[PDB]
Design a protein around this ligand. Structure first.
Ligand SMILES: *[C@@H]1O[C@H](CO)[C@@H](O[C@@H]2O[C@H](CO)[C@@H](O)[C@H](O)[C@H]2NC(C)=O)[C@H](O)[C@H]1NC(C)=O
Ligand SMILES: *[C@@H]1O[C@H](CO)[C@@H](O[C@@H]2O[C@H](CO)[C@@H](O)[C@H](O)[C@H]2NC(C)=O)[C@H](O)[C@H]1NC(C)=O
Ligand code: NAG
Ligand code: NAG
Ligand code: NAG
Ligand code: NAG
Lengths: 188, 188
């Protein structure tokens, strides 16, 4: 599956914002499609396309709004892989002390990932690559100082990404896990 | 956790092969510890150490022989993550057509991974980095041409690796999945 528009085609940005002022910053001058120059990504990877092979317009048509939300349509069941009988592939897993986990988001949320898993494995939409700082303000890395249990399981493919990394849903939010002496942030 | 031996220390290769003829090729001239110059790996990654922070000798003492096998001690239950109640975190998952998977090994085996998942996530021992060719003779990449089900789940940490990628145990071997029109290899 690939976009029929060529590399020399002017119609590649069909059905997008088509904002001349931003077109050097965001793909098609459309912030939802992410930046023209990708920052960090945590050879064969060429098999994967930022839009899963669709064209920008077709990408937005498949994944954005669709319901009335005015934002992305997220996968079912917090994005865990769903087995052939309709149940998430996930169970309570105890994180050993010294484990590195990270979160793309502020300490309010309850989701973590194995540290430095690749962006493409998290099945995040492309608007989240919109970053100028080396490392985003909300990106955090932690070590497990004190064992605790999470709902752990594979990440379903979504938003044209292959997914199939692993994610941890915590039972307290990250701020609380820091406060109670489970997660210790680290700096550079 | 880090190795007390320094970067200027001559004792770093304590308890290893200590083979002067190979020491430029393998760490400590010991093929089990992998190469001195790593080929492909599919910034923050610095958090991870090829030996999980142990010293070469201590690594071999923890992970190698231990039983009489004369080889690495592998994780229980084919290396799937094991939940707090002792059951693997894994279920039957149907691979959609167009999915890229790969295998580090010949078509005889029954294990696959999401294509281009990072080495450190597979929890493979370091002897498997012993490679001169750009891509090893047995490394294969495939696309799913026809849907089928696998036992899918997270990979447990092991051999000093963080693991926590995802692996697929197939029910027929890879050669059979090729023959019956499920997997299509691709070339470069
Ligand atoms: C292209 O994007 C730019 C940048 O956001 C938009 O420029 C703004 O347009 C609004 C219109 O109400 C003005 O009030 C702002 O002052 C503008 N800001 C800048 C930085 O230029 C622009 O509207 C977009 N183009 C189109 C056609 O919508
Ligand atoms: C260091 O490794 C080399 C390379 O494998 C070993 O060299 C071989 O040694 C055997 C000893 O029986 C000879 O028969 C081979 O001809 C050697 N091959 C080469 C390419 O040199 C060597 O034995 C190792 N060193 C030690 C101390 O065991
Ligand atoms: C989404 O769909 C609704 C209803 O069709 C529409 O009013 C809205 O403008 C669309 N776009 C956004 C960004 O909400
Ligand atoms: C997992 O842990 C939570 C919170 O401690 C508990 O309520 C739940 O029953 C446990 N079991 C499973 C299978 O999630
Ligand atoms: C492993 O252990 C056995 C029994 O202790 C010993 O005979 C053998 O030499 C050891 N090493 C290897 C590589 O088998
Ligand atoms: C998975 O698939 C296999 C082979 O088709 C089947 O025997 C097994 O019962 C299925 N269910 C689970 C939970 O593995």
């Amino acid at each position: 599956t690939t976009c029929p528009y060529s590399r020399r085609s002017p119609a590649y940005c069909a059905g997008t914002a088509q904002n001349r002022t931003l077109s050097a910053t965001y793909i098609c001058g459309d912030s939802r499609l992410g930046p023209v120059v990708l920052p960090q990504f945590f050879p064969i990877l060429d098999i994967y396309d930022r839009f899963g092979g669709l064209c920008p317009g077709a990408f937005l048509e498949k994944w954005f709004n669709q319901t009335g939300s005015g934002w992305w349509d997220y996968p079912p069941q917090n994005g865990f892989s769903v087995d052939d009988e309709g149940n998430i592939i996930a169970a309570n897993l105890t994180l050993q002390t010294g484990t590195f986990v990270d979160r793309f988001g502020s300490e309010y949320g309850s989701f973590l990932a194995p540290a430095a898993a690749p962006y493409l494995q998290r099945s995040l939409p492309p608007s989240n690559l919109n970053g100028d700082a080396k490392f985003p303000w909300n990106y955090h890395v932690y070590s497990v100082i004190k064992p605790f249990a999470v709902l752990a399981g594979p990440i379903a493919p979504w938003f044209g990404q292959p997914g199939q990394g692993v994610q941890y849903q915590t039972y307290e939010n990250v701020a609380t896990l820091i406060a109670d002496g489970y997660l210790k942030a680290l700096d550079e």
